[PDB]
């Protein structure tokens, strides 16, 4: 009973939207490409890549219904499910790019760091492997989110798609444990492995003085945009989980807690950058 506004959610939302698709389909496709031609040549990042970027398309594909929603006036038209399926993709779909963003760097850190040792967790099986479990973790999760019937009606007759207001008590505990594995684990993870990977690139003798300084502007440059994509949502999630509940709150924080959603869609767009296009494999093949 707390009909909130959403000027903002019906004004900058279809900008965005249109423009990922437009850049970020293509731009996935050639990345595909890509990470088939290091597969074919016995590289255990190809399957990485291909994974990645598999995902980050099922991302995409979702964006057009999404982008219907938007377009018409609170109204969710299409069916009584594909909610619980594009809400999936939306919400929940973005931990497998992360996911795989760990992996790349563990590989890197077990490969410039300590090149003569761990010769069988760098294999295509191995690979293969950890993809799987992920993308059974996708799948138990994705078996999930289906248990609770998510559809309201407003006040004005609409379809919500994926969001209560007045939080559920079933979704605080989703959200305290989604900060923690999603956003301490893998933000860990990341940083310890590339300072290592610094350290190791500093000690060098080999690399003139000029790549090292390139080496630290990509390392930093991904990192941060990792950061700038995902922190502020995680931080406002935190916010409305803990103590901003009470409807007058609720009322409050909802261009923040949206903002931070909207703009946490550009990974589709960061990753084939720094994963596919910055590097000199990829300018020889063009």
Known sequence: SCTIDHTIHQTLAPVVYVTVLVVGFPANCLSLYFGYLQIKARNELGVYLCNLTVADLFYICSLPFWLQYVLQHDNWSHGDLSCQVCGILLYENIYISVGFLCCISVDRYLAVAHPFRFHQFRTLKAAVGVSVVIWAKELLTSIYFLMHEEVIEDENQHRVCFEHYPIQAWQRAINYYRFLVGFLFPICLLLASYQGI?????????????????????????????????????????????????????????????????????????????????????????
């Open 198 to 286: 610094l350290r190791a690139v500093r000690r060098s003798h080999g690399t003139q003085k000029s790549r090292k300084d390139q080496i630290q502007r990509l390392v930093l440059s991904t990192v941060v945009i990792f950061l700038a994509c995902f922190l502020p949502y995680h931080v406002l999630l935190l916010v409305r989980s803990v103590w901003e509940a009470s409807c007058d709150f609720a009322k409050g924080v909802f261009n923040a807690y949206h903002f931070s959603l909207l703009l946490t869609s550009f990974n589709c767009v960061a990753d084939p950058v720094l994963y596919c296009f910055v590097s000199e494999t990829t300018h020889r093949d063009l």
